[PDB]
Amino acid sequence: MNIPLSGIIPPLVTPLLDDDVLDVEGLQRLIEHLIAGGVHALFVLGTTGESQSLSYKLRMEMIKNTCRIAKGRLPVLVCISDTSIVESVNLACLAADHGADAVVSAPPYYFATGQPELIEFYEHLLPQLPLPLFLYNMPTHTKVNFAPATIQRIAENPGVIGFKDSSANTVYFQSVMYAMKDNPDFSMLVGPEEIMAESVLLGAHGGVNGGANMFPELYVSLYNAAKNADMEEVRRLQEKVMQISATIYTVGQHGSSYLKGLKCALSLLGICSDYVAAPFHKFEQRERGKIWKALQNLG
């Protein structure tokens, strides 16, 4: 792993044949498509990867297979978030055993607590982990953000090397950048792709952007444009990312519109299965048709 991890780091979907069956052939296709597209690392079992909805055995298979297929060509980050900390540590050990480079952890959804309790949780977790850690802020779930100073503090431990934000809240994100400005080796990553460009312009290291599963070259181009402040390219490419956001992710009449749209598009592009794990369901033909048309209108 490069210090600081930078660039586009797609959160892989977990392609499925069935609720409890990994689509290994499509995983292979996806990973080659990403690598050939110039992405900088692979991120497995994120939200985009349906981690929580999958069985334990299937999560282990996604890790093992991703590590096998990638064959050291790129760093692999494994999201170890789990309601059970024991199970979280076990995923971390699996990851180390199969050659992953780092783990990624958000506190459990039910862990609505104060900051001192967040700090103590991580202080007790870190000794148990065999790989460097990225902290994962996904606020909806806890109703509690890592406070900037809390990130400062946990980032003292040399086993903590970065931070991924999936708040779309950029006031919060800039507050953490400011708090971390004297530790420039600490990787500051942004989840939502719609704000990757503007965040990178202001010094964010990279984007953990789900749309890069589809069009890795687009997101890598936009990242580089933003990095070098080529403003005409930033504007032209941002409009494409935004068209995708408005057209590929908004078809659901039943929830998880982003995940269903992404997975449908991946199947339409011939990359991997669009099977979505229960209790959710893949797009049927009407919605799928809309995703087809949206895809043709991007070009």
Determine the Cα–Cα distance for residues 282 and 277; give it in Å rounded to an integer: 8
Which tokens belong to 201?
């312009």
The answer to whether 285 touches 251, Cβ cutoff 8 Å, is no
Residues that bind a second copy (CB under 8 A): 19-20, 52-58, 83-87, 107-114, 117, 120-121, 124-125, 140-141, 148, 168-172, 174-175, 177-179, 181, 192, 194-195, 197-199, 201-203, 229, 231, 234-235, 238-239, 242-243, 245-246, 253-256, 277-281
The binder of 21, among a second copy, Na ion, none, by C-beta within 5 to 8 A per type, is none
Determine the Cα–Cα distance for residues 70 and 65; give it in Å rounded to an integer: 8
The binder of 56, among Na ion, a second copy, none, by C-beta within 5 to 8 A per type, is a second copy
Considering the complex, what minimum distance in angstroms separates the CB of residue 175 from a second copy? 7
Q: Residue 34: helix, strand or coil by DSSP?
A: helix
Q: Which residues are catalytic?
A: 136, 164
Work out whether 58 is an interface residue with Na ion (CB under 5 A).
no
The answer to whether 99 touches 67, Cβ cutoff 8 Å, is yes
**Residue closer to Na ion (CB basis): 162 or 206:** 162
The answer to whether 100 touches 69, Cβ cutoff 8 Å, is no
Considering the complex, what minimum distance in angstroms separates the CB of residue 54 from a second copy? 6
**Residue closer to a second copy (CB basis): 56 or 184:** 56
Work out whether 155 is an interface residue with Na ion (CB under 5 A).
yes
**Residue closer to a second copy (CB basis): 91 or 271:** 91
Bond preceding residue 279 cis, omega within 30 of 0? yes
Q: How far is residue 237 from each of residues 40, 116, 171, 192, 210, measured CA to CA in Å?
A: 19, 42, 23, 15, 16
Work out whether 154 is an interface residue with Na ion (CB under 5 A).
no
Task: Please report where in the chains the tokens 């692999």 appear, as a residue.
Answer: 76
Q: Residue 63: helix, strand or coil by DSSP?
A: helix
How many residues bind Na ion, per CB under 5 A? 2
**Residues placed in the known binding site for pyruvate:** 48, 208
